[PDB]
Design a protein around this ligand. Structure first.
Ligand SMILES: COc1ccc2c(c1)[C@H](CC(=O)N[C@H](C(=O)N[C@@H](CCc1ccccc1)C(=O)NCc1ccc(C)cc1)[C@@H](C)O)CC2=O
Ligand SMILES: [Mg+2]
Ligand SMILES: [Mg+2]
Ligand SMILES: [Mg+2]
Ligand SMILES: [Mg+2]
Lengths: 212, 235, 233, 242, 222, 237, 241, 233
């Protein structure tokens, strides 16, 4: 798995691969690693497939409950803290999850929280998570500027997951891309690595360790 | 536990009624100490004075209570208060502030008022204490679980009579020795007996420890009460 | 955490045209000590069902009590207990499978492998297996332990698929059972010459044979075997 | 006084009957089920002019497709609402779908049954019945728009139209005449506003009365004050011209 | 030590058509190197036009199927006979599986039916409830043998349009029930040749907008 | 219930007895190697399915129970008896002796007369069977009181039933075969139906006999039932 | 334990124990709250039965629930302490889990729920208390005032009052509180609050206490001298005609 | 006499009566009428549903318990929901554990015992609902009547609720005819629809008034309402 989220001038880019593995077996290439919690909230999934899918779906439920109770959308801070506190109750039982909670509210602005099954919860502008994280970090960090256009930021996110899909045996499949705004997530498509690699090679003139 | 049509609590009311028959206890706070004096309920020559304490109890080294009501109920409460003071000492390495101990005790009483269908405790307390936030303090608590702070107060029998007398002679600038006098005079005036003799009294002070910088609780032996009944001129 | 102590080897069984046959020897082993010799491991329930049990014998005895209690309880407030509301092999089975699976799920198994044989009330043969893990399956032939490795191959030569079952007679089937018991006595070090056998038939009912013995064994060829290779005398 | 679940010689439960009496003393709540939606309206009934009226919540969202209106001892209704929301969200967690309106009602009614101790046959964690009734309105794909009346007796009924609370005897008769299967949502809105106007003890404006509805397309909505005001212009003129 | 788990062999395969779905499984049940049965079905009609298989440890498979059939029964009772839709079945099964997260069912499970629009649908679960809808899936012992075939013959992966110098891919069409059964039979005769735990019999369950239909084919018995 | 009257009585139990007297009549008869149980079933309406509202109950395999009063209270008592016989067998392996079983029921019925939060049982139960050392017949009252009986009756026809029972004890001191006791049971049930004649009745008989049932509890049905019905029909006319 | 039902329904539909709980509030000392344009003021009357008190240490009637929210009551004093404690706990718990101090509405809903719970549980009696909860939501200048009562009903008020003779002061506030024109400042809001109490107290000596809540966790009690200056100015100015 | 003796179910009257239970029986007499009857091959429930208003739904009187079993209700409806749920659970348990369809008779015994505990425990009321239970099992069609005293009886036919005494007298009269209505679902329903008529001071029973349920030999238990009953009015 590789997943990333970063804040920039024009909001938040969220990008994830779609590969599922058991050992060295490739279980699926078309798995969904983003959860649309509500129109202003996203969750990313790395680690145990079941653990992630189950507890982030559950987080969706708890988030909806907050809306009904308080007649207001839950803050990114509070949604992340629900999942953080749940996971912490389970510490040492073998839950396995690395997770980003990403969204917009009026009071907070655009916000990313990283949450894992050790109970760590951090706020930050850039996170890459999963077995492919270091690869994503290499591309992302070396081309990251705060003032990137929306178009470029979308590309860099797309390009960082591709980096990782190529080098990390346990990443791949497709890129799923999201932009989070004031208004606020917009889906920017599914991009099969099968086609995307050749296209990026051609147009960018990169991937020179590759014959063909 | 139930409410009356008037919004009063029967069992609580009746417990207060019981307390008005108990020996009077008086507490006076002065600027350099506190006085606790209490009258023992119609005694006998054969009662052991030298090993008796029915109205005055030590809670820790800095806090004492005067009791009006059922002694057996008071011992239950006193014991939990003692424990509570030690928990606090263990948790914070500081002696418990007087209010905190009073509030906890009051809350246990309030509880019996609101759930569980047990009878309330038929007890009223005057607390005499010192701490480094408020210095000398005096508080009262009754079976309802309510509590209030005072410069001078009484409980048990003749409180209404004793309260008016204290109102009259009490002055802010008092020394403890003047408070000693006031308390003995007030019990003398309000007894339902010939005279207020030593054998019918319990007496205690919380002073600024002779000459030190420290707080000392003096629980008067019978002999001392007879001597202090001399000075104040009631033989 | 548990381990079998006193055990008893294969239970073997097949369907024929009209019913079922099941057999098991009369031994209770204590590791390699052939300790007890009058052990009955065929448990008749009603007269349409026999439960054959291998594995730990203390657990076996527990399952006997459970089955007797089951007969008592089904009789309670049941005027049709010996007719339309008689215990069926399938009820006995499902019950045992439930117990077996619950016990393994609590990490405290009944250390057995069990075959339930009988005829349903509509004449249908019933033959099913459950073991200490709650694993269940059904087959024209069934055997536990060594019987699985050695009796099944022999029994399957007779009934190899469903369509072979109208074709098999009581006599042929019992012959195959008796012969497989002899093979087990030849090759299983935890077996015994004495066994019980039960036939449950849609016409005949329940025939329970006790104190059967393996007969017609071949041992004569042993006199010619000298040494382990080169030795001549 | 002897018990909390004793039968009368007629065969009724004392406490259940009296809780029904507490509901008659409540504000008025009216619901009407069309084929274009279900309208829910309530009398706010502020006890003083110093009370801020929009702080009066007698219409609540349960899920996007389910709203409810209460009448009686409205404080009792908190835990019923909490339970209803949890049941609907939970159902969506377990099943990735919306809970049927009828199923949600049945669950609220099961909760209402739980007075006593554990009545020797299971467990009752509540000392008296609820003193509040609910009108439960929503849409689902099987049965479309639906209106239920949930009573502290744990029974519920479906209704084409229904009134509860102090003005309910009078409002119900009115609904018996005005209701027909054909009403638009707008026709039904007006009818709720009309019938509240009749039975209320103030002059009905946009502060002492509240409107809401649920449609398949837009979900459950509580109309804001400006919108209801404009429906109250509209009712005034419709009747003054008839 | 007592080991609560075993392995019963066994291979299952789901393919979704346009207006049908199939779920196939071999009928052989094994333990170690022995054969328990040559005919023990492990694909089940669960009512509401849903079929299910849970393959691996057969005792956990049976337990799950039972538990889910029971879910379907109680769904009718509590929701006034509402049909349990395939996506709702899927979500439910996730909670069944994840409920045992710390003492799992050793099964890989597949369900098959029609979705809300009457399109063929296939859902597959890991042992602890992670799940996905897919056009097709093989599960169990010979899964690693059969899946890549499916990727190639159902989703036409790595197949390009002849002459286009690999840009135009073979366009993803839908397969008839006849073509699907052909791939199923071939997938299983392949698996029987190369996997020792696979053989004896093939049972196929076909689901359409008229119910559930059964088909059976002999497999090699060695 | 926990309440003694000023003269040492328990009115609630006395009232529980009234529920019993109000009940249908039932009996048991001890014979030379067993026990026979019989009960009157009032046919309220022709709609009642004949032979199909069985009142006599078995406990374990060797014990019959019949009761008069509130039927639900009897079923409750038998459920408890079955649990109590299972627990005995589980620990001691042997099926419960009738005297042992009696006391188990006794202690349980008596317990429901100790506490203000419980009512006594509204039945008398007649029960027994064969054990290791012979046949036994018992009767148990709402107070928990029980003794061994040669013959027993309770319910509305109790008085005449006892009179008939008393005659048999006098004519047959040398023990009554199991087959005779069956006939006589059918007779006695007829001779207590006199009282409740307004509505029709149906007869139920069960027996437990060492030589006739192998010491197992069995229902009398078919030819044996018809023959006992005939005996009673001919001996009432 | 003991969970025998004490609060049950009357033939005509009331819960008697809750109704009698309101009676306890009626005989409790009076308390009032009014909200300015940019503040809220809380006023309470102290009784005159006993006057040899120590004001340093006697629990005053306004309580901080958090740094931005306050609570006063009328009714059983001991009963109020159970509510104030739970509210304080809830407020810290909410900062812990939602990473934000409570809204005044949230805190009210919470206290009200506790009160409601004690009207339908076996073995407990309802709270002989009604409350006024006042303050400002995090990062909000718009003032908030809420009332709760033993039933668990709650609501917001521009101004409200509870306790003995609350009827009089309510009447006073209805005539004197103008919704379009809230008291524009602190000083003029305190005055209107003192005026309403003077209607019931009859000398405002150490018997009238005032607490002022401004936005963003700014809460100050008032001394004798600051209150005295209000009483002095009120009775002198309002006597001529 | 009725004075201090009807405070709870834990007190006998000096006549030996339990008034709380007799009062519970009185709520049944208030409930709307329902009829059950059966032949050798089918059993039918017929119920008159009751509205709370002309703007309301007629509330349901028939509840499915299993594929071979269900019941109708008269009295407190939420009490019917408690008991049918328990019965659904008992049916289910029997299927899962024993793979056995629960005998209608055992369902009777179970409901009876459950009602019983409530006639003897301090601080709980008896159930205030009467039930008519129909099913098809291994000994055929069955009808049962359940009273909250715990008395359950097996009948060819019966009625409970308000004015039910008419229907009962009719069934008492018709007996020998409807008992033989075999293999003809529609004639048996007609006999039930006619029997319920003898109990109308009401109105002419409408397409909403009417609830019919059936179970038998080759028919799962099924509920008819609305349009699907018109052909019987
Ligand atoms: C008894 O058998 C057991 C018991 C316990 C457990 C498993 C099997 C599981 C088998 C199992 O591995 N199942 C697989 C799984 O979880 N794979 C992981 C990698 C392995 C991994 C990495 C970290 C922690 C656990 C597992 C994976 O692909 N993660 C990326 C991903 C993220 C999100 C989504 C939606 C899908 C995929 C699924 C895809 O089949 C692991 C587990 O908890
Ligand atoms: Mg669905
Ligand atoms: Mg093979
Ligand atoms: Mg007692
Ligand atoms: Mg008798």
């Amino acid at each position: 798995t590789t997943t990333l989220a970063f804040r920039f001038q024009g909001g938040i880019i969220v990008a994830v691969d779609s590969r599922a593995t058991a050992g060295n077996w490739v279980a699926s290439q078309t798995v969904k690693k983003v959860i649309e919690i509500n129109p202003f909230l996203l969750g990313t999934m790395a680690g145990g497939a079941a653990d992630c899918q189950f507890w982030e779906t559950w987080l969706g439920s708890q988030c909806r409950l907050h809306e009904l109770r308080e007649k207001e959308r839950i803050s990114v801070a509070a949604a992340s803290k629900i999942l953080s506190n749940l996971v912490y109750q389970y510490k040492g039982a073998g839950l396995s999850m690395g997770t980003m909670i990403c969204g917009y509210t009026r009071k907070e602005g655009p916000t990313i929280y990283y949450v894992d099954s050790d109970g760590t919860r951090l706020k930050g502008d850039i996170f890459c998570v999963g077995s492919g994280q270091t690869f994503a970090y290499g591309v992302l960090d070396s081309n990251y500027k705060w003032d990137l256009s929306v178009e470029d930021a979308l590309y860099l996110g797309k390009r960082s997951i591709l980096a990782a899909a190529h080098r990390d045996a346990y990443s791949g499949g497709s890129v799923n891309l999201y932009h989070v705004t004031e208004d606020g997530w917009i889906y920017h498509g599914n991009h099969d690595v099968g086609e995307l690699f050749w296209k990026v090679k051609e147009e960018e003139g990169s991937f020179n360790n590759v014959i063909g | 536990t139930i409410f009356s049509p008037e919004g009063r609590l029967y069992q609580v009311e009746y417990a207060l009624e019981s307390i008005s028959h108990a020996g009077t206890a008086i507490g006076i706070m002065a600027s350099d100490g506190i006085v606790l004096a209490a009258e023992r309920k119609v005694t006998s020559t054969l009662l052991e004075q030298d090993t008796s304490t029915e109205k005055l109890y030590k809670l820790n080294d800095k806090i004492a209570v005067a009791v009006a009501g059922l002694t057996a109920d008071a011992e239950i409460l006193i014991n939990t208060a003692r424990i509570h003071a030690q928990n606090y000492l263990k948790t914070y390495n500081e002696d418990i502030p007087v209010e905190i101990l009073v509030r906890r005790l009051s809350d246990i009483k309030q509880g019996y008022t609101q759930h569980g269908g047990l009878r309330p405790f038929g007890v009223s307390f005057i607390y005499a204490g010192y701490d480094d936030r408020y210095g000398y303090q005096l508080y009262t608590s009754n079976p309802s679980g309510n509590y209030t702070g005072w410069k001078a107060i009484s409980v048990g029998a003749n409180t209404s009579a004793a309260q008016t007398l204290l109102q009259m002679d009490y002055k802010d600038d008092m020394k403890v020795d003047d408070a000693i006098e006031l308390a003995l005079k007030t019990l003398s005036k309000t007894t339902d007996s010939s005279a207020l003799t030593y054998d019918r009294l319990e007496f205690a002070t919380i002073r600024k420890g002779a000459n030190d910088g420290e707080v000392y609780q003096k629980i008067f032996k019978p002999q001392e009460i007879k001597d202090i009944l001399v000075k104040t001129g009631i033989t | 955490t548990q381990q079998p102590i006193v055990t008893g080897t294969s239970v073997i069984s097949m369907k024929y045209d009209n019913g079922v046959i099941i057999a098991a020897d009369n031994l209770g082993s204590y590791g390699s000590l052939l300790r007890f010799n009058g052990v009955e491991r065929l448990i008749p329930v009603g007269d349409n069902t026999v439960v054959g049990i291998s594995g730990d014998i203390s657990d076996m005895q527990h399952i006997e009590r459970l089955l007797k209690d089951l007969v008592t309880e089904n009789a309670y407030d049941n005027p049709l207990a010996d007719a339309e509301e008689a215990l069926e092999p399938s009820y006995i089975f499902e019950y045992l499978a439930t117990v077996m699976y619950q016990r393994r799920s609590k990490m405290n198994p009944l250390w057995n492998a069990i075959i339930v044989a009988g005829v349903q009330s509509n004449g249908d043969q019933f033959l099913r297996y459950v073991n200490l893990l709650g694993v269940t399956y059904s087959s024209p032939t069934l055997a536990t332990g060594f019987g699985a490795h050695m009796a099944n191959p022999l029994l399957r030569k007779v009934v190899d698929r469903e369509s072979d079952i109208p074709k098999t007679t009581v006599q042929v089937a019992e012959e195959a059972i008796v012969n497989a018991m002899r093979v087990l006595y030849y090759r299983d070090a935890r077996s015994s010459r004495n066994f019980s056998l039960a036939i449950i038939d849609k016409n005949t009912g329940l025939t329970f044979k006790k104190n059967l013995q393996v007969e017609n064994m071949k041992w004569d060829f042993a006199k010619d075997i000298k040494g382990y290779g080169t030795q001549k005398i | 006084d002897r018990g909390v679940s004793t039968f009368s010689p007629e065969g009724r439960l004392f406490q259940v009957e009296y809780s029904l009496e507490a509901i008659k003393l409540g504000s008025t709540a009216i619901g009407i089920a069309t084929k274009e939606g279900v309208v829910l309206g309530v009398e706010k009934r502020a006890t003083s002019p110093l009370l801020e009226s929009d702080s009066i919540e007698k219409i609540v969202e349960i899920d996007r497709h389910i709203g409810c209106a209460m009448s009686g001892l409205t404080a009792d209704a908190r835990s019923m609402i909490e339970h209803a929301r949890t049941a609907a969200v939970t159902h969506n967690l377990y099943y990735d779908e919306d809970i049927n309106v009828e199923s949600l009602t049945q669950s609220v009614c099961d909760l209402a049954l739980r007075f006593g101790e554990g009545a020797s046959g299971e467990e009752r964690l509540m000392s008296r019945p609820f003193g509040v009734a609910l009108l439960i309105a929503g849409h689902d794909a099987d049965d479309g728009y639906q209106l239920f009346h949930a009573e502290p007796s744990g029974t519920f009924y479906r209704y084409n139209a229904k009134a509860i609370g102090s003005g309910s005897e009078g409002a119900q008769a009115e609904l018996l005449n005005e209701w027909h299967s054909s009403l638009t949502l707008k026709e039904a809105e007006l009818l709720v506003l009309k019938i509240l106007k009749q039975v209320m003890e103030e002059k009905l404006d946009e502060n002492n009365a509240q409107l809401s509805c649920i449609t398949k397309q837009d979900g459950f909505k509580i109309y804001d004050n400006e919108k209801t005001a404009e429906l109250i212009k509209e009712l005034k003129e419709k009747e003054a011209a008839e | 030590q007592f080991n609560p788990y075993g392995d019963n062999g066994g291979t299952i395969l789901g393919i979704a058509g346009e207006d049908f779905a199939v779920l196939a499984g071999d009928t052989r049940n094994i333990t170690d190197y022995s054969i328990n049965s040559r005919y023990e079905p492990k694909v089940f009609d669960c009512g509401d036009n849903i079929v299910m298989s849970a393959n691996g440890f057969a005792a956990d498979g049976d337990a799950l199927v039972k538990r889910f059939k029971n879910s379907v029964k109680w769904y009718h009772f509590d929701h006034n006979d509402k049909k349990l839709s395939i996506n709702s079945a899927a979500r439910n099964i996730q909670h069944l599986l994840y409920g045992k997260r710390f003492f799992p069912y050793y099964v890989h499970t597949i369900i098959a039916g029609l979705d809300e629009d009457g399109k063929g649908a296939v859902y597959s679960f890991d042992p602890v409830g992670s799940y996905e809808r897919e056009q097709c899936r093989a599960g169990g012992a010979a899964a690693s043998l059969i899946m890549p075939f499916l990727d190639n013959q159902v989703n036409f992966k790595n197949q390009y349009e002849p002459g286009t110098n690999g840009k135009v891919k073979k366009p993803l069409k839908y397969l008839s029930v006849e073509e699907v059964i052909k791939l199923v039979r071939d997938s299983f005769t392949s698996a029987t040749e190369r996997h020792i735990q696979v053989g004896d019999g093939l049972e196929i369950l076909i689901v359409t907008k008229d119910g559930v239909r059964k088909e059976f084919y002999e497999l090699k018995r060695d | 219930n926990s309440v003694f009257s000023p003269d040492g009585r328990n009115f609630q139990v006395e009232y529980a007895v009234k529920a019993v007297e109000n009940g249908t009549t039932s009996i048991g008869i001890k014979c030379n190697d067993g026990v026979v149980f019989a009960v009157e079933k009032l046919i309220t309406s022709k709609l009642l399915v004949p032979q199909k509202n069985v009142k006599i109950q078995v406990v374990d395999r060797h014990i019959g129970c019949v009761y008069s009063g509130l039927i639900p209270d009897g079923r409750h008592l038998v459920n408890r008896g079955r649990e109590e016989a299972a627990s005995f067998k589980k620990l001691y392996k042997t099926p419960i002796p009738i005297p042992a079983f009696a006391d188990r029921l006794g202690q349980y019925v008596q317990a429901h007369t100790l506490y203000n939060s419980v009512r006594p049982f509204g039945v008398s139960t007649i029960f027994g069977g064969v054990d290791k050392n012979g046949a036994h017949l018992y009767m148990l009252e709402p107070s928990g009181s029980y003794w061994g009986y040669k013959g027993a009756a309770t319910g509305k026809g109790r008085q005449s039933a006892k009179a008939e029972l008393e005659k048999l004890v006098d004519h047959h001191p040398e023990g009554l075969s199991a087959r005779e006791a069956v006939k006589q049971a059918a007779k006695i049930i007829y001779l207590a139906h006199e009282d409740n004649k307004e509505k029709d009745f149906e007869l139920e008989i069960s027996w437990c006999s060492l030589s006739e049932t192998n010491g197992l509890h069995k229902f009398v049905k078919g030819d044996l039932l018809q023959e006992a019905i005939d005996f009673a029909q001919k001996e009432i006319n | 334990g003991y969970d025998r039902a004490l609060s049950i329904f009357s033939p005509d539909g009331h819960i008697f124990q809750v109704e009698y709980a309101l009676e306890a509030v009626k005989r409790g000392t009076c308390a009032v709250g009014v909200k300015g344009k940019n503040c809220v003021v809380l006023g309470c009357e102290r009784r005159s039965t006993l006057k040899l008190q120590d004001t340093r240490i006697t629990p005053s009637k306004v309580s901080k629930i958090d740094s931005h929210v306050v609570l006063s009551f009328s009714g059983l004093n001991a009963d109020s302490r159970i509510l104030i404690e739970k509210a304080r706990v809830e407020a810290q718990s909410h900062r812990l889990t939602l990473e934000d101090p409570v809204t005044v509405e949230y805190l009210t809903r919470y206290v009200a729920g506790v009160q409601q719970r004690y009207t339908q549980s076996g073995g407990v009696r309802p709270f002989g208390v009604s409350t006024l909860i006042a303050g400002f939501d995090p990062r909000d200048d718009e003032p908030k005032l809420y009332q709760t009562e033993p039933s668990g009903i709650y609501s917001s008020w521009s101004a409200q009052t509870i306790g003995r003779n609350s009827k009089t002061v309510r009447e006073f506030l209805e005539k004197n509180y103008d919704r379009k024109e809230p008291p524009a400042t602190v000083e003029e809001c305190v005055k209107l609050t003192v005026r309403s109490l003077l209607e019931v107290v009859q000398t405002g000596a150490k018997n009238i206490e005032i607490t002022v809540v401004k936005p963003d966790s700014d809460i100050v009690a008032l001394s004798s001298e600051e209150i005295n200056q209000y009483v002095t100015q009120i009775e002198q100015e309002k006597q001529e005609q | 006499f009725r004075n201090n003796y009807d405070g709870d179910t834990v007190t006998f009257s000096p006549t030996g009566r339990l008034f709380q239970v007799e009062y519970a029986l009185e709520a049944i007499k208030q409930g709307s009428v329902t009829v059950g009857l059966r032949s050798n091959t089918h059993a039918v429930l017929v119920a008159l549903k009751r509205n709370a208003d002309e703007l309301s739904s007629y509330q349901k009187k028939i509840i499915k318990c299993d594929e071979h079993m269900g019941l109708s209700l008269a009295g407190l409806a939420p009490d019917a929901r408690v008991l049918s749920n328990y019965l659904r659970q008992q049916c289910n348990y029997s299927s899962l554990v024993f793979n056995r369809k629960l005998a209608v008779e055992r369902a009777g015994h179970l409901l009876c015992d459950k009602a019983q505990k409530n006639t003897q425990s301090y601080g709980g009321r008896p159930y205030g609902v009467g039930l008519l239970i129909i099913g098809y099992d291994k000994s055929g069609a069955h009808l049962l009547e359940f009273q909250p005293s715990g008395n359950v009886t097996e009948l060819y036919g019966t009625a409970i609720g308000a004015r039910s005494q008419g229907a009962k007298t009719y069934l008492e009269r018709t007996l020998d005819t409807f008992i033989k209505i075999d293999g003809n679902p529609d004639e048996l329903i007609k006999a039930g629809v006619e029997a319920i008529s003898q109990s109308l001071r009401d109105e002419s029973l409408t397409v909403d008034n009417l609830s019919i349920a059936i179970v038998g030999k080759d028919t799962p238990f099924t509920i008819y309402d609305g349009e699907a009953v018109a052909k019987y009015i």
